[PDB]
């Protein structure tokens, strides 16, 4: 069968009403299955429309408006899934197809259709006008003699689901890998994606991995990863492209640097973006708007920061900045610089490296800590020196008490709080130095993996003087706070999920919490084990 | 060559304001700061404030209420601004240049300006 | 705030001798020492940049040592030229300040 895209344009029109029509042909052109929706508009009269005899199927939903032409030749359409909606809740929309011209669609022949899957019908403004798990009709009772499927397609067969990747081993207790588990590319179960599409997280087989993931390679076949937090977005920095004749980050340019991570140059912050400069038409920037930059965790070249927000005590908009790389530098010098702030701490808890480039923090008259700090650390370049000069003297610091918190390694802080150590003393939690990791009181019970405590799994029962689990798995714990299977706490026994031949495997609650086989004859459930569980 | 040339009335009664100019060769104002330094015949040198390359300044402590340095890039020249001076104030004013970028070795300096405070 | 302390206050010496001006700062500032030279009616002279970084145009016989809170200007054969008031400077605390000085004079 052959497949097109679709179209989400909805009332849009495509250029003249012949360059409409031109780019609705090339699209639905000798397709029978409609990915999208099926989208006609602004077709005008005496235009052939007769190639929409090949349309089979339509996933999304159908779309017919504005159109002057005699007739839509939808004699073949058989089925509207629905997989969208137009407006409201209409799958099928048929609207207002006349002019002011005396001309409107006279024969809308969908003699096919017999089925809509999902969603009501809308008509208005037209003056002219078998098995289980089947949907259509059916060339027999059984389901792969049917027209079309409900749910699902595998070769003929009508399926409700596909065929899942993997299937749970009674055996061992864990997953093995289906050999004949499928992708779910439509209301198709193909065995591999098709030619440029991608794996979704789980099943399909889109063109697409879309936001919040990323593409992968896994086994020969690009896959779509989720994205640890946002995803990459590479972005320019000022000096270059979008900002070539920049002078600094300004009220106009502030915008464009949304969900960047990344940046391809430099970073300036100076007064004249507070003040505002006439001279190039750019109001005053409002500090709230530096926000912006807390996506940022790498910088290519170097950061330069002259002014601050008088009221913010510290760099607030780049405490997740990781690296500096210094690939480009102030007067070939620097790739850091912070003067005359009125900041009290740094705040660059996340920065572990600054490739190259020198490190200038001169005349920030309360700037605490930032001596604190072996800057010899985070550089890779040999040569790379820092000047720490004209800030708060640390005798002045220690008699308010700022000094790095106890918790802290000697490697020093980027400010007052636990999570500003630049390493722990004893251990950290989440991005915080701690005393003692939560080993036999407290909640959640952890474990130690290098300097760091590790949540327990939630099916580990808390020990009253003693530890509670040694790894991260629910296989670590000592008393399994629910359920178990085998060498797996849980807290539901496997009870609906598929396994080999093609069998629903079921399993109940032993007094002792311990989830046993059914009878196999039960199928659908079990509360016990014989045959008086079902 | 690096020059930094100053020019001012050096006789300021008590209570009205001081002004000098130090106008600047050699290098740019929008690369550099230039720092004022007074030194009075006891009291030692003493540092005043600044005028940042971005136009931001910062003045010393006791000099916040009174002071206002300025400048202007194009003519190259700053303008030192201190108000309600009195006889304590007497003393000769310097401007300076670091050698190097946002740092204090001051290695290139005005020829001074000798205020005297008296009516 | 922070005290830079110069001593002695006038140094009086024959030419060819060796010369060695004390600034001892009131807290340890690691190696952020500048130090000038100033002659009669003259300005500030740069000699010296973070303890002992020499600078271009000053004469050899200057130097600088020492580190933390005791910093040290030498010559190690004075001239008559070398008369001035030599002053150090402390980098480290805002706002940046100098000592009081100490006076060359020279024996002949």
């Known amino acids: 069968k052959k497949v097109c895209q679709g179209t989400s344009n909805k009332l849009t029109q495509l250029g003249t009403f012949e360059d409409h029509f031109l780019s609705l042909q090339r699209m639905f052109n000798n397709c029978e299955v409609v990915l999208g929706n099926l989208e006609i508009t602004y077709v005008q009269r005496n235009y052939d429309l007769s190639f929409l005899k090949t349309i089979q199927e339509v996933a999304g939903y159908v779309l017919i408006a504005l159109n002057t032409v005699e007739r839509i030749p939808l004699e073949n359409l058989q089925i509207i899934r629905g997989n969208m909606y137009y407006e409201n809740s209409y799958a099928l929309a048929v609207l207002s197809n006349y002019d002011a011209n005396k001309t409107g669609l006279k024969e809308l022949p969908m003699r096919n259709l017999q089925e809509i899957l999902h969603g009501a019908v809308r008509f208005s403004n037209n003056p002219a006008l078998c098995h289980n798990q089947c949907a259509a009709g059916c060339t027999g009772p059984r389901e792969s003699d049917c027209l079309v499927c409900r749910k699902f397609r595998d070769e003929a067969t009508c399926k409700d689901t596909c065929p899942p990747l993997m299937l749970y081993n009674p055996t061992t207790y864990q997953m093995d890998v289906n050999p004949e588990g499928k992708y779910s590319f439509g209301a198709t179960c193909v065995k591999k994606c098709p030619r440029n599409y991608v794996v979704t997280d789980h099943g399909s087989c889109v063109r697409a991995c879309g936001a919040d993931s990323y593409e992968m390679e896994e086994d020969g076949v690009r896959k779509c990863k989720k994205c640890e937090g946002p995803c990459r977005k590479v972005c320019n920095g000022i000096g270059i492209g979008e900002f070539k004749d920049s002078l600094s980050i300004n009220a106009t340019n502030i915008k464009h640097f949304k969900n960047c991570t990344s940046i391809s140059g430099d970073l300036h912050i100076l007064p004249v973006a507070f003040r505002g400069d006439s001279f190039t038409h750019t109001p005053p920037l409002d500090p709230q708007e530096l926000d912006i930059l807390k996506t940022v965790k790498e910088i290519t070249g170097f950061l330069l920061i002259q002014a601050w927000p008088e009221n913010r005590t510290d760099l607030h908009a780049f405490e997740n900045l990781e690296i500096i790389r210094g690939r480009t530098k102030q007067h070939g010098q620097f790739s850091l610089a912070v003067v005359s702030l009125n900041i009290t701490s740094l705040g660059l808890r996340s920065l572990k490296e600054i490739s190259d480039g020198d490190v200038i923090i001169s005349g920030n008259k309360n700037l605490c800590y930032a001596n604190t700090i072996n800057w010899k650390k985070l550089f890779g370049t040999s040569g790379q020196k820092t000047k720490i000069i004209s800030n708060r003297g640390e005798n002045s610091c220690k008699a308010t008490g700022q000094v790095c918190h106890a918790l802290c390694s000697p490697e020093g802080c980027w400010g007052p709080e636990p999570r500003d150590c630049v390493s722990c003393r004893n251990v950290s939690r989440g991005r915080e130095c701690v005393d003692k990791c939560n080993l036999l009181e407290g909640e959640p019970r952890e474990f130690v993996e290098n300097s760091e405590c590790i949540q327990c799994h939630p099916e580990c029962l808390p020990q009253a003087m003693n530890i509670t689990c040694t790894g991260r798995g629910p296989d670590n714990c000592i008393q399994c706070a629910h359920y178990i299977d085998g060498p797996h706490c849980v807290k539901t026994c496997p009870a609906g999920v598929m396994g080999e031949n093609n069998t629903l495997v079921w399993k109940y609650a032993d007094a002792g919490h311990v989830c046993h086989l059914c009878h196999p004859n039960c199928t659908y459930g079990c509360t016990g084990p014989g045959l008086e569980g079902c | 060559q690096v020059q930094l040339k100053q020019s001012g009335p050096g006789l300021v009664q008590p209570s009205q304001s001081l002004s000098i100019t130090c106008t600047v060769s050699?290098?740019?104002?929008?690369?550099?700061?230039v720092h004022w330094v007074r030194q009075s015949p006891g009291k030692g040198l003493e540092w005043l404030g600044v005028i940042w390359s971005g136009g931001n300044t910062d003045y010393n402590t006791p000099f916040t209420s009174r002071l206002s340095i300025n400048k202007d890039n194009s003519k190259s020249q700053v303008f030192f601004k201190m108000n309600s001076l009195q006889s304590n104030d007497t003393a000769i004013y310097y401007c300076?240049?670091?050698?190097?970028?946002?740092?204090?070795?001051?290695?290139?300096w005005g020829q001074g300006t000798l205020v005297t405070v008296s009516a | 705030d922070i005290l830079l302390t110069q001593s002695p206050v006038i140094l009086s010496v024959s030419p060819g001798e060796r010369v060695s001006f004390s600034c001892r700062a009131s807290?340890?500032?690691?190696?952020?020492i500048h130090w000038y030279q100033q002659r009669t009616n003259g300005s500030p002279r740069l000699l010296i940049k973070?303890?002992?970084e020499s600078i271009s145009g000053i004469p050899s016989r200057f130097s600088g040592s020492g580190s933390g809170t005791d910093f040290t200007l030498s010559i190690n054969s004075v001239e008559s030229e070398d008369i001035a008031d030599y002053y150090c400077?402390?980098?480290?605390?805002?706002?940046?300040?100098f000592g009081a000085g100490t006076k060359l004079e020279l024996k002949r």
């Open positions: 300076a240049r670091a050698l190097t970028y946002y740092d204090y070795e001051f290695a290139y």
């Open positions: 400077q402390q980098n480290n605390n805002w706002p940046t300040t």
């Open positions: 050699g290098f740019s104002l929008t690369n550099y700061g």
């Open positions: 973070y303890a002992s």
């Open positions: 807290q340890s500032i690691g190696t952020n």
